[PDB]
Amino acid sequence: SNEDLPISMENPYKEPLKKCILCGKHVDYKNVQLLSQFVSPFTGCIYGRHITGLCGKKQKEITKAIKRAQIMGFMPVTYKDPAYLKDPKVCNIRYR
Amino acid sequence: KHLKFIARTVMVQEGNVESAYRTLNRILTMDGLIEDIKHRRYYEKPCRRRQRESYERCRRIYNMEMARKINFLMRKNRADPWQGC
Amino acid sequence: YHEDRIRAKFYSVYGSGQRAFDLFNPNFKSTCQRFVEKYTELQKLGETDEEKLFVETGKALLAEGVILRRVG
Amino acid sequence: PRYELALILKAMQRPETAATLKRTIEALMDRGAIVRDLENLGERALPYRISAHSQQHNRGGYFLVDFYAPTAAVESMVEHLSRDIDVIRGNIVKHPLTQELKECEGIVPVPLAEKLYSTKKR
Amino acid sequence: REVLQLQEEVKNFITRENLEARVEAALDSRKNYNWAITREGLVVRPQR
Amino acid sequence: HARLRALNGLLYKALTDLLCTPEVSQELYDLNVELSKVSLTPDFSACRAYWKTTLSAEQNAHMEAVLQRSAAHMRHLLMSQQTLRNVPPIVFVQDKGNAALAELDQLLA
Amino acid sequence: RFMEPYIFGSRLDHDIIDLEQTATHLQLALNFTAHMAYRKGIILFISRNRQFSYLIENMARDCGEYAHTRYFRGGMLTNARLLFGPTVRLPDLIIFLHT
Amino acid sequence: TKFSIYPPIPGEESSLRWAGKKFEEIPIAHIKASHNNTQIQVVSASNEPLAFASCGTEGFRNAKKGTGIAAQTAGIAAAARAKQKGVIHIRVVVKGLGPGRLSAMHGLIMGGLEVISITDNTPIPHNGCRPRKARKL
RNA sequence: AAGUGUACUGAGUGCACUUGGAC
RNA sequence: AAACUCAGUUGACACAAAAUAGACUACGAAAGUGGCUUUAACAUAUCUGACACAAUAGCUAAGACCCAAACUGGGAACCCCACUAUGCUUAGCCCUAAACCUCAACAGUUAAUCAACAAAACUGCUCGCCAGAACACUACGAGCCACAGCUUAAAACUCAAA
Ligand code: FES
Ligand SMILES: [Mg+2]
Ligand SMILES: [Mg+2]
Ligand SMILES: [Mg+2]
Ligand SMILES: [Mg+2]
Numbered sequence: 001s002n003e004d005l006p007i008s009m010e011n012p013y014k015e016p017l018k019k020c021i022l023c024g025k026h027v028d029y030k031n032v033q034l035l036s037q038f039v040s041p042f043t044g045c046i047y048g049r050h051i052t053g054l055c056g057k058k059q060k061e062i063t064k065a066i067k068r069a070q071i072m073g074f075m076p077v078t079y080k081d082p083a084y085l086k087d088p089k090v091c092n093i094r095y096r
Numbered sequence: 097k098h099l100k101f102i103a104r105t106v107m108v109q110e111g112n113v114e115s116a117y118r119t120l121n122r123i124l125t126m127d128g129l130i131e132d133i134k135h136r137r138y139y140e141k142p143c144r145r146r147q148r149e150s151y152e153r154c155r156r157i158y159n160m161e162m163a164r165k166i167n168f169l170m171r172k173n174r175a176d177p178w179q180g181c
Numbered sequence: 182y183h184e185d186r187i188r189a190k191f192y193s194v195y196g197s198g199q200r201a202f203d204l205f206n207p208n209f210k211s212t213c214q215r216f217v218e219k220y221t222e223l224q225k226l227g228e229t230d231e232e233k234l235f236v237e238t239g240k241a242l243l244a245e246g247v248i249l250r251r252v253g
Numbered sequence: 254p255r256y257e258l259a260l261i262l263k264a265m266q267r268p269e270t271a272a273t274l275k276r277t278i279e280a281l282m283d284r285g286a287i288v289r290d291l292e293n294l295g296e297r298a299l300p301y302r303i304s305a306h307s308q309q310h311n312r313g314g315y316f317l318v319d320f321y322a323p324t325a326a327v328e329s330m331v332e333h334l335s336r337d338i339d340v341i342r343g344n345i346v347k348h349p350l351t352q353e354l355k356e357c358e359g360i361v362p363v364p365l366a367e368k369l370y371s372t373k374k375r
Numbered sequence: 376r377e378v379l380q381l382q383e384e385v386k387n388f389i390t391r392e393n394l395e396a397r398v399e400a401a402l403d404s405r406k407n408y409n410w411a412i413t414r415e416g417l418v419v420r421p422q423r
Numbered sequence: 424h425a426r427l428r429a430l431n432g433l434l435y436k437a438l439t440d441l442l443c444t445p446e447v448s449q450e451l452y453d454l455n456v457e458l459s460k461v462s463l464t465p466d467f468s469a470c471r472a473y474w475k476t477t478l479s480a481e482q483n484a485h486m487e488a489v490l491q492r493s494a495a496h497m498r499h500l501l502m503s504q505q506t507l508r509n510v511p512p513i514v515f516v517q518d519k520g521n522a523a524l525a526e527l528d529q530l531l532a
Numbered sequence: 533r534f535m536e537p538y539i540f541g542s543r544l545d546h547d548i549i550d551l552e553q554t555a556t557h558l559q560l561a562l563n564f565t566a567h568m569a570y571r572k573g574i575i576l577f578i579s580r581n582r583q584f585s586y587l588i589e590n591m592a593r594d595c596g597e598y599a600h601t602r603y604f605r606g607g608m609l610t611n612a613r614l615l616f617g618p619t620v621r622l623p624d625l626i627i628f629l630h631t
Numbered sequence: 632t633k634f635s636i637y638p639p640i641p642g643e644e645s646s647l648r649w650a651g652k653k654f655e656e657i658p659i660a661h662i663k664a665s666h667n668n669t670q671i672q673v674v675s676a677s678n679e680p681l682a683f684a685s686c687g688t689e690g691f692r693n694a695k696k697g698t699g700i701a702a703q704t705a706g707i708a709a710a711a712r713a714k715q716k717g718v719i720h721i722r723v724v725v726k727g728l729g730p731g732r733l734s735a736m737h738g739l740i741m742g743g744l745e746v747i748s749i750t751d752n753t754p755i756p757h758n759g760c761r762p763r764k765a766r767k768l
Numbered sequence: 769a770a771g772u773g774u775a776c777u778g779a780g781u782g783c784a785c786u787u788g789g790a791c
Numbered sequence: 792a793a794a795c796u797c798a799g800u801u802g803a804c805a806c807a808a809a810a811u812a813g814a815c816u817a818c819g820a821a822a823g824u825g826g827c828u829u830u831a832a833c834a835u836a837u838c839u840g841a842c843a844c845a846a847u848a849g850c851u852a853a854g855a856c857c858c859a860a861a862c863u864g865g866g867a868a869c870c871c872c873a874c875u876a877u878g879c880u881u882a883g884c885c886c887u888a889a890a891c892c893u894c895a896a897c898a899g900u901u902a903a904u905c906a907a908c909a910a911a912a913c914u915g916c917u918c919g920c921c922a923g924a925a926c927a928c929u930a931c932g933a934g935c936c937a938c939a940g941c942u943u944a945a946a947a948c949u950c951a952a953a
Contacts, residue, residue: 006541007182012189013544017359021416026354030259030294033409033421038812041637042104043127045811055360056815063812064827071827072344073261073313076300078103082640087411088419095123097302101724104751105638113723113736116749119636122452125445129755132810133728134440136756138505138765139859143785148503151791153814157366160814178582181602256829267402274398278389288389291401294408304803317406327829344828367816372911374904429768429870440728499791505765509769509790661800670799678801685799758809758826760858761878764782767869 021090022058029065032075036084038062038091044078047091104129184217190235191216196252212249216242255289255348256327258318260334261303261341263310264296270314273339277318280333286322299341306338313341319348427463430507435461437506438472438497446500447493454486459518469511473518483517490515565625569597573624576600581630588629598623638748649720649747657747658713660721660739664729669702671735673713673721673744682712686731702731703738710742724750 027034038052039045046066049059069075104124108116124130140148191213200212210218220238228234239249258281262273278288294315302309322330327345334343389397411419438458445452459473474490476483494513501510538557540550568575575597577588585601592599600608608615612622639645639654649657658681661672673682684705686696695701713721721744723736736746 009183009185012186013192017361019357019359019416021412021414023357023359024354025412025416025418026349028349028408030408031410033411037411040127040811042106042123043129043811044103045127045129046813048812048814050814052812055357057357059812059815066812067827068346070300072259073299073301073303073342074259076098076102078098081300082102082637084411085637088413090412090414093126095119095126097304098300099641100752101638101722101748101750104753105748106750107634107636107638107748108746109634109636111746113740113746113749114733116636117733117736118452120749120751121444122449124751124753128811129753130444130446130728132755133753134446134504136762136810139762140505141784147787149813154369155791156814157369178585181582181585271395271398271402274402275394278394278398282391290387291389291398292406293401293404295405309803316401324830331829346828368910371909373909374911375908426768426869433766433768439730443728443732495791502791508765508767512791659800663799668798672799674800680800683799687798755810756808757811759807761808763859 020053020055020058022054022062027058027061027065029068029072030074031065032069032081033084033087035062035066035069035075036080037087037089039066039080041080041085042095044076044080047093051091051093053090053092184221187217187220187235188213192252194235194239194251195249198248198250212247215247216249219245254324255319255321255351256286257346257348258320258330258334259344259346260316260318261299261313261343262316263339263341264312264314265339269339273337274316277334277337277340281318281320281322281326281330284322284326284329284333286320286326286330288318288320290319292317292319303341305341310341424465427465430463431461433506434463434470434472434501434510437501437504441497441500447496448489451489451493454489456486456490459520464511467511469514471514471516473516475521476517476519487515487517565627568625571624574598574621575625575627576623577627577629578604579629580604584629638750649745652720654722654748657720657722658718660709660723660744660746662723662725662732662735664702664725664727664732664735666697666727666729668696669705669729669731669735671705671709671739673709673716673718681716681718682709684709684712697730699731699734699737702729702734703741705731706735706738706740707742710739710744713744714742718744720745720747722746722748722750724752726752726754728753 038047040047046063052059054062066075070077106116106120198212202211203209216238219242220234223234223238242249262270281288296312296314298312299310302311330345334340409421413419435458438461441447442456457475459475462471494515498510498513501507538549538553540548565575577592577597577599579588579601588601589599609622612620639647641655647654656676658673658675661674663670668686670685672680674680686701686705689701689704689708691698691701723746725732740746
């Protein structure tokens with residue numbers, strides 16, 4: 001009929017979802033070097049999702065991994081282990 | 097059963113113990129430990145704790161929305177570009 | 182429109198470049214518009230593969246002299 | 254199914270540790286497990302002091318006995334590890350590789366909070 | 376295909392025949408599971 | 424009234440403890456406010472917290488503004504701590520009684 | 533909601549007004565306005581867009597018809613008789629440059 | 632080298648020293664700051680009691696104990712005792728939230744002991760003893 | 769602060785629950 | 792004040808409770824469920840529809856008893872001190888909560904809004920429930936009890952209100 005009729009199609013300009021830094025990467029309860037990144041250096045308190053910038057699934061996975069490591073003796077409970085202080089800062093925190 | 101002095105320890109810089117203590121207290125407040133201590137001085141019944149947490153979440157969201165609205169509409173405060181009309 | 186796919190891919194591959202939009206000229210045609218036209222004529226030729234159409238359109242416009250600067 | 258036994262052993266000499274590991278694998282086989290593989294994460298200082306068998310230790314050797322066993326064998330394995338003295342601490346978990354890595358497209362968008370306030374004409 | 380791969384793996388499992396040799400080899404060796412992640416999702420394997 | 428006096432003492436201690444930390448706010452904590460006393464209205468309609476003023480006028484104004492902005496949050500924190508089941512609105516009042524003594528001693532010197 | 537029939541579609545979450553419908557509606561509206569002008573009725577241009585207040589006032593003065601772009605006192609039409617006088621003649625047609 | 636606020640790692644070759652003594656070796660000044668008392672104990676790295684002080688010891692009675700001046704006096708007395716014992720540097724570790732929490736350190740410094748590290752050890756129970764119900768007035 | 773259930777005491781208290789209250 | 796001669800560090804150390812995550816809103820029919828591991832495991836037609844459960848409290852027998860705490864006692868109902876039932880485990884009972892999202896299940900709709908407030912308004916379909924207030928979560932009888940209580944539940948008299 002008329003070739004200029006707008007067509008029914010999905011958005012091509014839509015951008016892919018912002019994958020969380022851990023999305024598609026398997027969290028493990030033995031990767032203390034990783035879990036340390038998501039706990040408070042001075043107290044060992046687990047950072048909330050509003051600080052870790054992680055989706056619900058991976059936030060829960062990190063929480064469970066941290067608890068499992070702590071109870072099984074892989075991770076200190078009351079502090080980020082000093083060996084991992086130089087690791088990249090992946091939590092939006094402004095102590096200083 | 098942990099190692100001592102690794103938790104909640106701050107090294108004083110040049111002896112400004114006041115500044116170091118302020119930093120330590122800031123750390124405690126940021127991690128909420130002071131909240132926990134002063135709340136655990138007495139026992140909040142589970143019903144009261146649930147009500148308080150719901151109220152806190154509602155107030156947090158309301159404040160966030162109000163601040164966002166204020167920031168969004170602040171730009172219009174610019175002097176009137178059509179004065180005299 | 183069907184050409185929206187081409188526009189999206191061109192923006193992804195080369196960005197907005199430098200030929201800023203002169204929105205006042207109704208007959209204005211940008212680099213993305215030129216790419217869309219060349220893609221359409223290439224498809225009409227008989228070539229049907231999408232990726233081949235895209236790459237050959239880029240090369241053809243390069244030959245035409247278009248500075249198809251790559252965004253990334 | 255496929256289990257992983259994380260084992261923290263009292264830090265001590267090579268012949269001793271080999272004997273303890275052999276005894277543990279013997280216990281697993283008696284309990285019917287098909288020991289898959291043995292891994293060693295080395296010795297290191299325990300994150301926090303752990304007491305066991307009228308004693309406390311600060312350094313331990315970490316190992317991961319991956320195996321397959323009938324479900325019933327797990328309780329017996331736990332009891333055996335608890336009774337053993339050379340084991341600072343033994344835990345048994347469902348082997349992580351068993352769980353499938355369900356793929357997430359990413360972070361889904363966050364709309365306005367779900368009906369946290371009324372819709373009436375107010 | 377799954378069972379075929381499993382068959383291959385079983386040849387490398389632990390048996391009483393190779394029990395002691397495998398135990399000693401594991402003792403000599405050392406596996407590592409630690410690795411951090413940057414802000415951009417880059418795995419940073421730790422040098423030993 | 425003895426009950427009112429006890430309430431004033433408890434509220435003074437609680438407010439001092441609150442201000443000891445950034446719990447209310449880092450901005451408030453940095454100001455290092457010192458409370459002179461606490462007085463409850465006879466009907467329990469208000470709680471006046473008398474805070475000592477500094478010499479700097481701009482500092483006094485800023486401290487007053489921050490205190491007024493944080494009074495409600497402090498009230499909520501108290502009622503959450505259960506230091507008092509019900510706390511009336513908190514009003515921060517400047518205290519300047521010590522200025523007379525200070526300037527006396529200055530002149531007498 | 534009520535502008536859905538007139539909206540041609542959405543382009544990147546921006547509505548596009550169907551210019552065919554706009555052309556028909558503008559034809560009808562201009563025709564009606566011209567008819568009222570020919571019948572010598574009173575046409576009043578109303579709009580509270582301060583960006584175009586000056587332009588609208590000048591256009592009204594040029595065309596002879598009247599304009600009201602400033603703040604709209606309550607009842608300037610409902611209570612027109614008391615606000616203006618018993619014999620006041622009310623506008624025979626209004627044109628909302630901004631509704 | 633740029634300063635750091637984390638404590639030195641025990642069993643690590645840290646060039647930092649104080650009169651040649653290593654951080655772990657430095658005596659520890661426990662400070663318990665309760666609601667109605669403040670107690671200080673400087674103890675050797677082997678936790679040998681080197682000096683002890685409190686508001687009760689300094690004589691402040693009942694309410695007067697919970698005062699910054701009382702805490703300062705306790706700190707000064709403990710500092711004098713520790714100095715007589717031969718102490719110079721001290722690692723301050725504090726628990727509780729008593730009013731003399733900072734005045735104790737103030738008095739200790741005024742008495743002449745160099746605080747090298749301020750540490751907290753507040754007994755925060757994850758979940759244990761159920762606390763008593765809330766007062767009411 | 770109010771109230772529901774429940775129990776002691778002689779209106780309060782104890783435990784849990786609800787906001788049909790305030791922050 | 793009363794009370795203890797006990798207090799601080801360090802070490803050992805639970806049959807109690809389960810920071811942070813949790814700003815998440817998931818599981819379960821409901822009550823409820825937020826320490827870790829393992830096992831078992833989360834009914835169903837592709838509709839609705841009376842034996843089994845039922846928080847806290849309470850009782851029986853035996854254990855545990857850090858801490859908290861009706862009651863008691865002491866100190867100057869409310870405040871402070873100590874302590875008991877009880878909160879806990881086992882094995883049995885009782886079956887009531889503002890047991891509430893105070894909004895029954897299932898299917899469907901957004902077409903024309905509607906006492907008011909509350910959680911926008913409705914349609915179909917089924918079961919349960921109500922016919923002014925108080926008398927009255929009461930009496931009588933009955934069931935459960937195993938005797939001090941719960942469930943069921945009235946009447947008379949009164950009023951023009953509630
Ligand atoms: S965003 Fe995909 S797993 Fe976290
Ligand atoms: Mg049915
Ligand atoms: Mg039923
Ligand atoms: Mg029950
Ligand atoms: Mg008891």
